[PDB]
């Protein structure tokens, strides 16, 4: 990734091209978080603009918590889409489990249809490059028979089985053995395990539930930057070189090569743990951690 900037410059000619290329290469990937309630083009207060995001950055999730103004999805739509398209960054909507197990939406073939139907909205209106399921729960046999009708209606328009280049992607705090996994891995373009404050030491174990259901390069290991008046995870500690997220960047599963790694909250990308203010960034950390992956 020597093509990436040493700051947070916006490339534009041959500098940009470059960007480009690096991003159509073998290399491992880099996802963040951007949660939309800290948009300044979402209500009043923030200081961090999706418009900031490193030109080197693989993958934005759009991460509502569903108070955002409409002003948020405007811009999303007519200005931040478009902006991170020109520098070869992807554009995926999260959505919770809790979305494809709602029981308004029936529980038959045309409610998985319908129900995807609905979400796969959030990904049109939007022109954006596919849908994320966070799941962080396990689901009993109706929940379970829900979410798998909604996902395998999905595949027909994203993932691997669609053949659209959209993605589906799989992020989760469980492991391979929940159910809802063993019955979507099909459908699936990467999958993205939150590891916020976890053991080095067991990282290996996590992706060993995986690995029967992919390859490696679909498999993503997630810390949290530090949210304002949040949980203390002590992933982005300093120095950076000893951080988790350093030693994440760093972990490769034996014999294997890993997709890469995400954030959670690269809106607060270098703020220092229990600063509860809110500050612009320059993405040190993301555009550091990019190089630890492409050196
Ligand atoms: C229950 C928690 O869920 C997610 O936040 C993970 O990132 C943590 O490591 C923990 O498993």
Redesign the pocket.
């Known amino acids: 990734s020597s093509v990436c900037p040493s700051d947070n410059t916006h490339a534009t000619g041959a500098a940009l091209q470059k960007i480009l290329d690096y991003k159509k290469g073998d290399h491992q990937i880099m996802a963040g978080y951007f949660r939309s309630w800290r948009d300044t083009a979402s209500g009043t207060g923030n200081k961090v603009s999706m418009l900031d995001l490193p030109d080197c950055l693989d993958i934005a999730f759009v991460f509502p918590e569903g108070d955002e103004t409409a002003s948020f999805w405007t811009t999303l739509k007519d200005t931040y889409v478009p902006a991170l398209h020109g520098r070869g960054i992807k554009v995926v909507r999260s959505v919770g489990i809790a979305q494809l197990i709602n029981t308004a939406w029936d529980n038959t073939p045309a409610g998985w249809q319908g129900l995807a139907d609905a979400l796969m909205k959030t990904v049109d209106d939007y022109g954006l490059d596919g849908l994320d399921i966070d799941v ?1 729960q396990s689901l009993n046999a109706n929940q379970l028979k829900q979410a798998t009708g909604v996902f395998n209606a999905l595949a027909k328009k994203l993932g691997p089985k669609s053949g659209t280049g959209k993605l589906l992607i799989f992020d989760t ?2 492991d391979g053995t929940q159910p809802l996994w063993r019955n979507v891995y099909p459908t699936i373009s990467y999958v993205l ?6 053991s080095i030491s067991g990282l290996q174990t996590t992706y060993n539930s995986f690995k029967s259901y992919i390859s490696s390069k679909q498999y993503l290991i ?3 930057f530090y949210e304002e008046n949040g ?1 203390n ?1 002590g992933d982005t500690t300093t120095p950076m070189t000893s951080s988790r997220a350093w030693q994440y960047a760093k972990w490769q599963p034996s014999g294997a090569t890993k997709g890469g790694i995400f954030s ?1 909250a690269i809106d607060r990308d270098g703020v220092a743990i229990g600063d509860n203010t809110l500050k612009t960034t320059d993405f040190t950390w993301t555009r550091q951690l990019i190089g630890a992956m492409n050196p």
């Not at 395990?193 to 976890?198: F, M």
């Open positions: 962080e705090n469980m395990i939150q590891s916020y404050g976890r997630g810390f949290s949980t995870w959670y």
